[PDB]
Amino acid sequence: SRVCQVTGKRPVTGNNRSHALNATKRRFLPNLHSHRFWVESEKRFVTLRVSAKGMRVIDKKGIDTVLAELRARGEKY
């Protein structure tokens, strides 16, 4: 499903409002991309489905620090 592995951002619902304030239901999807991260800890590439924010979290922290948080929840990568 369209869920970021890092942040847990998933598709939220909301209205899409017109000029005459016609409320029509929609979905905000997150900006997901399958990306390959080089884990220097064990010398390999790890493919994760992350949001564009996710990438910034992985860049702010360490990929290994993020994988530590991922492995604690009981996920795969």
Partner RNA sequence: UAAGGUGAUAUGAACCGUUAUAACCGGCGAUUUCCGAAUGGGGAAACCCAGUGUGUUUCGACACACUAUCAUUAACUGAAUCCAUAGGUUAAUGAGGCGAACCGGGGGAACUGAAACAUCUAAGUACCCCGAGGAAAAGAAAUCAACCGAGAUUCCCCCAGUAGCGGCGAGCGAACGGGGAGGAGCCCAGAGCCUGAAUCAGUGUGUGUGUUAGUGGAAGCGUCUGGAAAGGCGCGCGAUACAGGGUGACAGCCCCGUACACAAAAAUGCACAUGCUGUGAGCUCGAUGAGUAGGGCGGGACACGUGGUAUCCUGUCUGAAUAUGGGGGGACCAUCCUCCAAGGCUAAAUACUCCUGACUGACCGAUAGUGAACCAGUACCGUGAGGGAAAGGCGAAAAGAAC
Partner RNA sequence: AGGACCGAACCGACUAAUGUCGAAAAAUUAGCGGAUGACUUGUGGCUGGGGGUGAAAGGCCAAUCAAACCGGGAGAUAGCU
Partner RNA sequence: UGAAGGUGUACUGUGAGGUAUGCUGGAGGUAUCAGAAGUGCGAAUGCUGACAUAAGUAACGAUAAAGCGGGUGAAAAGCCCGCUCGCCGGAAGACCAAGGGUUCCUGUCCAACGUUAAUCGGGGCAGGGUGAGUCGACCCCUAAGGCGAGGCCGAAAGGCGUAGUCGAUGGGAAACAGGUUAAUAUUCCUGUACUUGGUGUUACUGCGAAGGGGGGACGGAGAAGGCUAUGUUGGCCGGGCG
Partner RNA sequence: UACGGUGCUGAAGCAACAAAUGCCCUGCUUCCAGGAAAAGCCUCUAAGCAUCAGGUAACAUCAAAUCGUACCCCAAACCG
List of residues contacting RNA (CB under 7 A): 1-4, 9-17, 20-23, 25, 28-31, 34, 49, 51-53, 56-57, 59-61, 74, 76
CB 22 within 8 A of CB 5: no
Distance in Å, CB of 67 to RNA, minimum = 13
Minimum Å gap between C-beta 40 and RNA is 15
**Nearer CB in complex with RNA: 29/68:** 29
In Å, how far from its chain's centre is CA 62?
15
* C-alpha torsion 53→55→60→66, nearest 10: 110
